[PDB]
Subunit: 47 residues, 2 copies
């Protein structure tokens, strides 16, 4: 509402946003892996 039925809306710079989305998500995934390795390394260091 209030758009009647289904309307076609166009996203600004879909490909450019997709490229930066891939870069940011890949960096976030690297952060997740590094944080997991950080926990494992610290646990190994303690034990």
């Amino acid at each position: 509402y209030p758009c009647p039925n289904t309307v076609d809306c166009f996203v600004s710079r879909p490909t450019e946003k997709t490229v930066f989305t891939v870069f940011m998500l890949a960096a976030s995934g690297i952060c997740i892996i590094l944080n997991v390795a950080e926990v494992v390394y610290l646990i190994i260091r303690a034990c």
Copy 2:
């Protein structure tokens, strides 16, 4: 085509056109009945 998905289009004077449609169709139906009566009356006159 080319209207995307379904669009809402508005008819000009829908009620006024409906009223005149009823008048014309009723008159046409009267013409049909009168023509049938014309054929029957002429057949009866011949026989």
